[model samples]
Target: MSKGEELFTGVVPILVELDGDVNGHKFSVSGEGEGDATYGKLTLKFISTTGKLPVPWPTLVTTLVQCFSRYPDHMKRHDFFKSAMPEGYVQERTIFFKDDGNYKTRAEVKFEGDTLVNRIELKGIDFKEDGNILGHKLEYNYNCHNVYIMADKQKNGIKVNFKIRHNIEDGSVQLADHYQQNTPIGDGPVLLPDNHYLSTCSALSKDPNEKRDHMVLLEFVTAAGI
Candidate 1:
């Protein structure tokens, strides 16, 4: 590791290691209309396996809510909102939060119809205990790209799908820090004078970024009024 990325000497222990299948993942969107009208809705899920975190679980969860609550506004600033939606589409959004008592929280996004919503949810959840210090925290960058958006008409209803990708930019964390940073570490594409494979090696390797960081895959599918 680079000197800039040194590990703290302080002692830090892994609270726990977890393994499980992510099931019942679903996100939906809906639309409504009248003469010169518009609408949109979205829903999605995120799961974290690493039980590492720097702050209390509630703090992390609150940060998540604040970030997603502003995503739509960001899209509008980039003209993505206007470009992705059909004409006469009204804008509406929802951030999914479910608490089955005892601080057990589930996070998801619900988007209204006539809008496009694509996101990769990332979170470090501690399912073992109800209070703080159960699971690791998931840290990530906001850099994202809109891969594509599609709407197809069928005899019964209109089908829509939205795709997006996320990337880790330039943040690093230490192994034994008070706020442990769970960022991906690795090399990126570099030009080689002798060979070209170095330029496109990511396609050949499990993780092209040279870091085995995680990738969020988001695809929202919905059949209007179905």
Candidate 2:
């Protein structure tokens, strides 16, 4: 072809062709939460309309833990903790160094009931609105050298609250970078969102503002706990 020289820049005049193309698709899916007893499963089946933007569908669409109980006393901590395991804890919680395609529960250990006894009470967790994952089952990734979950044992209602902790490390909790974790006046919501996404930059962005923590951060995590 005459156009072949242009594609090859006259270097031996070879033909160059491409089989790639770009497209957009609209994706819609109802996120559903279902469980067999205390074990939970979340369903996100997408329906794409072929013209907006369809994310490369994921096989394991893990979402935040959800709770469907009317009382705080009825929630299961083990399920939320397990969900976190598949979502991302295997490497960090257990010394992934020894985790060679590990399938034993120790691989996920990730934690002992020490999490149950020291960090969280043996008490169960619950919240209002749609039965969504309660952060109560989790210990903020690193176990709150940056933060801690609180029982907020008061008369209004007993729910988990996140509180600032210091002295776990020689690192100053007062440092400017440590802004949100240590500020007592900081406030926020702990509830997960239904209408919107709590995103990838969730720590850097405002999902913390709207969903979990407030602008100044939180001394007491907000209504999600209340």
What CA RMSD would candidate 2 show? 25.6
TM per model?
0.19, 0.19
lDDT per residue as tens, model 1, 14-98: 1111122112222221211111101111122222334332332222222121111112221322221222222212221221222
Cα lDDT tens digits, model 2, 1-226, are: 1111111121111111111111211123221112221111112122222332221111101111212111122222211222222121221111110101110111111122212010100111122112111112211212122211222213111122122221112342211011111011112212211111111111111233233221111111111222
Model 2 lDDT vs. the true structure?
0.18
Name the regions of candidate 1 deviating beyond 4 angstroms: 1-136, 155-226
Candidate 2: regions farther than 4 A off: 1-27, 31-33, 50-53, 59-65, 68-226
For candidate 2, give the lDDT of residue 146: 20
Local distance difference test values of all predictions, in order: 0.21, 0.18
Cα error, candidate 2, residue 214 (Å): 35
